[PDB]
Amino acid sequence: KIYSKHTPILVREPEDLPQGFSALEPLVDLPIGINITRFQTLLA
């Protein structure tokens, strides 16, 4: 599972981490079979 809050139109400076609790829903569920200990998300 990968819980993502891809929130656009943020009327605020980036600055620091956002405040307030933020509920997230899962957006992926696929049968790998093993468990993951590393990754690399390509940045374009």
Next chain:
Amino acid sequence: NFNGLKGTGVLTESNKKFLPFQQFGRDIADTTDAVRDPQTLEILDITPC
């Protein structure tokens, strides 16, 4: 017999909206009371006799 669960009751229509990764609904007493039909994907409700 919904995909494996055996019970008894009456099935009606409910307005609860399941998340896509969920299939069963519970209550206070931790017993199932809402199921999703495997063939057609509407949400039902379970109440006893």
